Amino acid sequence: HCEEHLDPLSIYCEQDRTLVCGVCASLGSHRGHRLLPAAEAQARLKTQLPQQKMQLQEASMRKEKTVAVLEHQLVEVEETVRQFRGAVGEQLGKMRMFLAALESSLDREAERVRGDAGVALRRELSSLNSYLEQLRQMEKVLEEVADKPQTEFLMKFSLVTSRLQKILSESPPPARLDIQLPVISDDFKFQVWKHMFRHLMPALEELTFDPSSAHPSLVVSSSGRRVECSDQKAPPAGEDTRQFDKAVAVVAQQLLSQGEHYWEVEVGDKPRWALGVMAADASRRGRLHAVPSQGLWLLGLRDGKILEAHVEAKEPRALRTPERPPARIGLYLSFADGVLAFYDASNPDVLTPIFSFHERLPGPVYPIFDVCWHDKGKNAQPLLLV
Amino acid sequence: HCEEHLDPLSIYCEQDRTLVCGVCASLGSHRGHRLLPAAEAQARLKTQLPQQKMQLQEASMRKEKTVAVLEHQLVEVEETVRQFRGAVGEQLGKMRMFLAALESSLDREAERVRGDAGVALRRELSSLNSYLEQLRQMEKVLEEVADKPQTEFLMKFSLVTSRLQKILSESPPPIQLPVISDDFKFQVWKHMFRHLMPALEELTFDPSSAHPSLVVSSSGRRVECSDQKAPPAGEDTRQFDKAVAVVAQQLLSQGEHYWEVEVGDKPRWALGVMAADASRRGRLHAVPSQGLWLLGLRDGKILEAHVEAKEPRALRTPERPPARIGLYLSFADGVLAFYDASNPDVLTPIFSFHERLPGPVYPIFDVCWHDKGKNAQPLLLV
Ligand SMILES: [Zn+2]
Ligand SMILES: [Zn+2]
Ligand SMILES: [Zn+2]
Ligand SMILES: [Zn+2]
Ligand SMILES: [Zn+2]
């Protein structure tokens, strides 16, 4: 039963793992190998069965886990696609709503203009028709008087002449048309675009000044929305980390952590001030270095006209100063993009860029406002939360 | 017939303008006034009738003409309101069309990404399912072999082991959707500014007016200065002779227009508008008082506006030299604006004239000197 020697298979070669006969084991294929008979070789081979079963179970577990992960990824892909579609739809419907609102406002303005113009034209028509009726009556009276007897003519002619002179001196005023219809020019699209930039911003963040953190020389009135520096020399402050001691400034009660936020601060005619954000974990006392490495993103105006951005450098970076110092500053903060942008909000229709931070913000931060020293009275202008 | 003296009325008082009798004129009401007879007074009073009639006719004519004009305006009020509504609708429908197109494009991109990701993940799932099917078949083969006769066991165990080792050693080796952030609105806005412009005005260079040293190819949309010596030009006032430049065949007169010129890697060039009545030959002074509104780039990086002054006004030079310049011209507001059209997504402002332009003007392009060959880059109308 050797298939080559007609001898029954009775010897198992360990290193070849094949049944052979006695001739093959004595001389030939497996004469110098490690050879055993059935029993012990079979035992040694079945000893390896638990290892194979454990490896197979491990491989099956790994493959099933990978399949489950891929199915979870397919589900998350579907959810992500739906979320992206909905988010794009909402963000574009914002601008669509703005454009529809502008069109509606212009349409109601046109309705009012039509009504007023019609009323005014009807008034002028009534006035001129009454005046022309008076003219017609006077002309017919004159024509009838001109064909009267001598005495009646010479008695009524002067009365008729006086009446005619009176009605000719009582001419109706001109009463200019005044067609108050807003005419559109070619720049209408650009103006709408520049206003749409303002409508793109989020709602005005309702902030209130925190007196428990403000400098002792500052005072907060107008329901916590008007902070101003006092002209009194203040004693040194306490050992509180969250209260300013040398730099006269104040942070808001609200801490921003996530999303986008926008807020406007009115400085008016204040010659020296600063606005921005401060890290919540950074100490607020002592001499402060307005650098992002110390948790301070600030834009300042000094000497009444010099506008500086407090970027990470030895000295603040000078910026292109406008004709007049901006009277209202808008601040936009985006955590998802880590951007703090300062805009000139003096024009209610258009916001113009001042400076923007593009550095990765750790967060969360506090809105901080540095109302500087009153400087013997010429810096008593307050800071107002719009 | 005095009604007070029974004497007929025959004396007219000039300062009282009333007929009286002789008694009234001799003693009483009108004894010291200026008095005339009755018939002469009637003649003198009827002399004044034509003046009164003419004044009445003039006043009536004036008032009736004003009434007719006001009636026409009353009729036309509705037309004026309709015109304003339609103009506003068109100006806003521009942005509405842009937003609809952008939303459709984003939706198609998202659908394509979703389809590709689903196909790839299903392919990987099918591959792993086939691998697990192979594992199951091998496991069942092993379980069936483990209960075989002793000879069959000793002759198939090692083949099964080798196959299992092979299939275990040959295991298979194994987010790209753009999510929108808060700056998505601002990016859409900055892209919308470009679509706010009207259609690209199809202009073609005029060879009959260009300098003889220039050559116009690509169906009249690519003008370039050749490095070959050209013959002198003719004595035509509308053809450039010293300043190597070219104007377009089309003259803009009314409305708003926008056109883009590709300069590419050209170091020195100029673009703008020229008055149709200003002479084009000889040394030219690029000043608005002479019908020339030009923006130039020299030395590869210096950007200058040719405003009315002794020297051109230097402008903030960008990081890189602009590769495409867009020109917008509006007659209703008299504005010529130059924008950097290098980025197809966003246009950045360069300079804009806000002076009232008389018009009409020609789009003029100054492709500067060849400069011994290093200025042979062409100018292409996009
Ligand atoms: Zn044998
Ligand atoms: Zn052997
Ligand atoms: Zn608005
Ligand atoms: Zn009398
Ligand atoms: Zn008298």
Coordinates of C-alpha atoms and ligand atoms in Angstrom, one line a residue, chain B residues 13-18 20 24 29-35, ligand 5:
Chain B
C13 CA -64.1 160.5 -10.6
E14 CA -60.6 159.2 -11.5
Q15 CA -59.5 158.5 -7.9
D16 CA -62.8 156.9 -7.0
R17 CA -63.7 155.2 -10.3
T18 CA -67.4 155.8 -9.9
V20 CA -71.5 160.7 -10.3
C24 CA -71.6 165.4 -6.4
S29 CA -68.0 163.5 -2.4
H30 CA -65.9 164.4 -5.4
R31 CA -65.4 168.2 -5.3
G32 CA -61.6 168.3 -5.1
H33 CA -60.6 165.1 -7.0
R34 CA -59.7 164.5 -10.7
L35 CA -62.9 164.3 -12.8
Ligands
ZN5 ZN -64.1 161.3 -5.7

